[PDB]
Structures are given as C-alpha cells and as structure tokens.
Design a protein around this ligand. Sequence first.
Ligand code: SAM
Ligand code: SAM
Ligand code: SF4
Ligand code: SF4
Ligand code: SF4
Ligand code: SF4
Lengths: 326, 327
Amino acid sequence: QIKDKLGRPIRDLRLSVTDRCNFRCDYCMPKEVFGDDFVFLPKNELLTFDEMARIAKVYAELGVKKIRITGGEPLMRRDLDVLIAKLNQIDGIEDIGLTTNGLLLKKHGQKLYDAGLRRINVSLDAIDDTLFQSINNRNIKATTILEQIDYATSIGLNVKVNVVIQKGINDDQIIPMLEYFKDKHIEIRFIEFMDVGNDNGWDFSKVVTKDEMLTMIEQHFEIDPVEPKYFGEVAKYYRHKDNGVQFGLITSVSQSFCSTCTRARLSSDGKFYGCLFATVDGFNVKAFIRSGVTDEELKEQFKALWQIRDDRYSDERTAQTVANRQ
Amino acid sequence: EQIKDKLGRPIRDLRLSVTDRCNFRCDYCMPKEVFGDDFVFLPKNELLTFDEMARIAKVYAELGVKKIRITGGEPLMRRDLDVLIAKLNQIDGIEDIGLTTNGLLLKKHGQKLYDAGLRRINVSLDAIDDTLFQSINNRNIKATTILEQIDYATSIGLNVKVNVVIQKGINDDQIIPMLEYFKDKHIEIRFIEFMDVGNDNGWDFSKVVTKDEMLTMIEQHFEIDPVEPKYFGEVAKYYRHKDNGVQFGLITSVSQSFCSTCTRARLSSDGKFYGCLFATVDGFNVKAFIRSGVTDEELKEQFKALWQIRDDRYSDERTAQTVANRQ
Ligand SMILES: C[S@@+](CC[C@H](N)C(=O)[O-])C[C@H]1O[C@@H](n2cnc3c(N)ncnc32)[C@H](O)[C@@H]1O
Ligand SMILES: C[S@@+](CC[C@H](N)C(=O)[O-])C[C@H]1O[C@@H](n2cnc3c(N)ncnc32)[C@H](O)[C@@H]1O
Ligand code: SF4
Ligand code: SF4
Ligand code: SF4
Ligand code: SF4
C-alpha cells in the first residue's frame, strides 16, 4: 500500500480538464488578469481523454477510488461525456464527481448522465441575482443557475452546492440559501474563505468561521449535529429537525485537515501536484507519457511522486498563525 | 525569543513531571500488574532537583515558554512541591503555572501550594459513583473523597477544573451525573476521548465514545449552545448551559487530532526531554547533560536545538493510519 511521508495513502484524483472558464469570479479568475488578451492552453497542450484514462487506470492500481473532474469550468471541455465513459470503465474507480458553475448543465447534462455521471457539485456564491453577477462579472443571474440545478436534478443527477463565504460580500446569503435548498432537499455546504496574509499565516479579515456561521444559523433554524459518516470526514454536517435535510460547513482555515488529505492532482497542462497550493511547476506527466513509456513505468513514476509527497500547506499556515499570536 | 520546530510550531508550554510515583493504579495508566509490589521506582537522586527544574524553566522562558504544567505520576506525592512552585513563580516570562492531580492530597498540601503562588489545578476524576471509581483507581479511593478535596481547594482560593476520560462500557454512564454535579458547583468539567492504538495500528475505537456521540447523549438532558473559541487553535470545544452559563469542554483527542497546534515540551521524571506525550524511545538526557557541567547558554542552545528538530505528531500519524486502514 502506497503512502506518502506523512503516512497518507492515495485516494482521490482531481482531474483538471480545462484552463478555460465562462465566469470571471472576482477571487478566482478576476477580469483584470484574464481579459480579452489572455491566451489559454491550445488544444494539443491539454491531455487527451485517452491519456487521462490511462493515468487514472494506473492510479486505481495505486489505491485511487474517486475522481473529481474540474478545471477551469469542466463543461467547456468539448466532449466531456467521452472522458466520463472511459473513466467509468476503470475497475477500481468507484465514484466520479464533477465540480461546475452549472451554467452549461442544460446543454451537456444529459450526455454526461448517459455516460455514467451521477454526482455533481455546483458552486454558487450567492442566490441573489444581482450579487451573484457582481461576483461572476459575466451578467449571469443566480436564478439561471438555480434553473440549471433543477434540470440536473430532473434527469437524475445528485446535486450538492458549494458556497465560499466572504464577510463584507457573501455574509448575508447564508440564511436565504439554506432556506431555498432546504425546501428542495439539496445538500448545501458553506466553505471558509482562504487567504494568507503578509505575516504568512491565515488572514481572518474576510473570514466567517464555521463557529460564527453556526451562531447565525441557529438563530434562524432548529438543528441537530450529524455524526461523521466515516472517520476523517471533512465537512461538518447538520440536519434541519423538521424534515431532516442536511447541510455542511467546511473548516478550511479554523480547523485545517492535511493529515487526512489523500488527494493527488493533475493540472490542465498535465502536471502532477500533491496539493492545491504549490509554488513550483510539478512533474510533467504529459511530457513523460508522450515519450513512450510502459504502464509499469508510469505506475512506478506516480508511486515515487507520491512516496516523496510531504505537502501540508494549510496546516503550515495554521502553525504560523499560532506562532504569530506571539 | 521564538523558536519553531520542523512543522512550524512554536514552543509555548512545558509539562514538568515531578515524580514517577502514584497513589492510584488506574487500569489504563499504571495497571497494578505492571506497577505492583516488585516494581522499582526511580531512586531519589535520579529525580531532577527543584533547582535543576527552575533553571530549566528559566532558559525555556527565554525561548518563549509561557505556561508550566506540573504533573507526574501524582505530583502531590513529591515532597516539598511548594518549594518548586515558589521558584517557578519567580521566573520572568512564565505567566501561568498549573497542576494536574488526582486530588487525593489536596487537603494535605493545598494551602502550602497556594501560599507559594499556585492558583489553578486540574483534577482528574473518571467517575462520581464510588463503586465504579474504586474499580478504576484500584486503591479503594472513593469519588466522594475526591469531591471533598475539590470543595476544600475552591474554598482556599484555588481555581479548579475537572478532567474525565471516557471509556465506552466503563464510565460513559457517568457523563450526565458529573455534568449535573459540577454545573451546580460552577466548576468547568472536560470530557476526553480515550486514546488507544489498535493492532493495525490506527486508533482503536472499541471504547472510544467520540465527541460527536458524547454530544448526542448530552443534548438530551441539557439545553446547550456552542461557545466560540477564546483564541485560534483552542483544542477543547466549549459549550455552556443556558441557565446559569456554566461551561464544559469536550476534547477530540482521537476523532479530531490536533498536532498542528501542539506547542508542548515535556520533561520526564527521570529528566529526559520529549516532544510528545507518546514516545517509544528514550529522549535526550537533559539530566545528565546539566550534571555534566554546562553554562546557561549551552543549556539554552541545546533546548533550542531539541525544539528545532522536533517533528512529533503521534495522534495525526495514528489518524492517517486509520484512514489508511479503511483501504
Ligand atoms: C476552481 S473552481 C473549478 C470548478 C468550477 N469552475 C466551479 O467553480 O465550480 C473550484 C472551487 O475553488 C473555490 N475557490 C477558489 N479560491 C478559493 C479560496 N480562496 N477559498 C475557498 N475556495 C476557493 C471556488 O469556490 C470553486 O468552488
Ligand atoms: C499521568 S496523569 C498525571 C497527573 C495525575 N496523576 C492525574 O491522574 O491527574 C495525567 C493524565 O493522563 C491521562 N491519560 C492517561 N492515559 C490516557 C488515555 N489513554 N486517554 C486519555 N487520557 C489518558 C489521565 O487520565 C490523567 O488525567
Ligand atoms: S466559475 Fe469556477 S473556475 Fe471559473 S472563475 Fe468561478 S470559481 Fe473560477
Ligand atoms: S492544503 Fe492540506 S488538505 Fe489542502 S490539498 Fe494541500 S495537503 Fe491537502
Ligand atoms: S492517578 Fe494519574 S498518574 Fe496515577 S495511575 Fe491514575 S492517571 Fe495515572
Ligand atoms: S500526539 Fe500530537 S498533540 Fe499530542 S503531544 Fe504529541 S504532537 Fe502534541
């Protein structure tokens, strides 16, 4: 069994499938930076679906059970159903999820379902249509994505919703969004906003922690804690007492979780990373694969990359924050 | 003035173990089968002296230690413990000195300790029913005796908190009676998840009651709200009674391990340094180091080196092995 320097196994391959996106969310792909001038990866500089499938097969043999399709906005990747069909035929792979702004769900949703997609995570940072647009800078209304969510649900997809909260910006959406998704029996998850400051610890200025979110929510809702489904479950779940619909809170910053992190990551340009943060360019899997290698030489290269992994960025910021309290 | 270890963690707390002796034989700590008649405890001269401890505490205060916890063993068994408290009370930079005790000897020594500057104690008490408690301590001590010690300690002006380790099948039926009793005494109680490493070798949950489960038990008898953390990376998760307002704590030693904020150095009763509560091998011989003849600077430089190479994270390792054993 394959474990890194901190004793963590490989479970979870995050597959980035494009660098492109149809939103320009102020904190992720700001319009300044990613303007009209931006040149994105060309077609041939992305991994093919066949190379993706090959990589996934090899990872399955090392322990990976789950694959999360991301980008970018994944639905801009043109024949995404084809990847999903190939991923769904890999034996050790048990779950495939997709993480999306949901805009293209009415165009590509049925195709993806028919290829074997069953679960999606839709990010939506407000339910107000105005405030959603000022976040996304592409004149989309939240109402539009709500309708996409309803379509996805109608064709049999399981939908969960991810909201990153910022304390001058998203503060006040917490209660309306719980009410709306409570009614629709859809699991929503509030996520603490991550931002490292000058002192190299966490910056709590635009943060609303799990514990303050929870003070807000109890004032408006009657609620019970749900016991962790399995050990090391990341999200802290709660249940509305009247109808048992669940929501979750993700303690990105106030309670870092690197010790249970089993996530390996392939960028859209085809480079291996052991963590969502990372200064240097990672191993060039794309280059390696295109210069003829056996499956066995691929497996051993991924094994060696994992066994050398000691990433724990969020825990490091956590420790530095303790140090800065002085 | 601020020293960090290999995982970015500053030194902040010093646990000083002052004896290996104890007046109990708690089944999960000093079982009588191991610590019975033929056990040999440390000779007196192999303990650190109080001067050695004060000198060690001083140099650690220069490296950023702010809190000292006195423990053991049962620290009240150490003769003239009040002389140690008095020397530690004279050290610049130390803001808090705490004692953790089973409490049995608090009537005997409490006033002396108070006089010497002690103001805070943490009393370990795993049950409030007498028959049960006797079955745990294995020395025929009644919980009622410990309760009277607690009430004397508060009366002389010590601040008392209570710690309770819960093992499923043994004392988990005690969570409610103890919450009720100390709620009415305005004393903060804390429940701690039992740590036990299984064969395999992540955590053994076989009795383990988790913080989550403890809370499901608790919210039925009492109406409760969270208390937000007083500071960032506070280990205990606090709650308060809506009545009233008395706080209690729950400690997720096993279900939510917290090595990332761990700022604890430890000296054993035989005077060896440990960077963690769990250790399989002997630590650096601080005791022989200082008895070999060293300067305060040489001492400080060694403590700084011991901390800079520290990478312990036992509970997180166990947590990772647990995730890894799920396959
Ligand atoms: C990069 S998008 C990729 C998939 C798709 N475009 C989407 O947004 O659903 C994935 C997530 O990163 C999150 N994100 C970016 N920066 C973040 C930050 N500083 N703190 C918390 N989440 C962040 C966004 O909320 C988003 O849900
Ligand atoms: C070594 S005693 C020293 C102080 C004093 N003799 C007392 O018992 O309070 C310190 C603590 O270690 C704790 N402890 C020992 N083994 C434990 C375990 N497996 N899980 C949780 N706590 C444990 C005991 O409950 C006790 O409170
Ligand atoms: S939609 Fe997703 S990838 Fe695009 S700018 Fe927003 S968070 Fe970023
Ligand atoms: S910051 Fe920690 S939990 Fe997040 S991807 Fe990196 S190692 Fe994993
Ligand atoms: S009283 Fe404290 S040191 Fe003594 S056996 Fe019990 S837990 Fe251990
Ligand atoms: S197990 Fe972790 S939290 Fe506990 S003393 Fe060791 S390093 Fe610190």
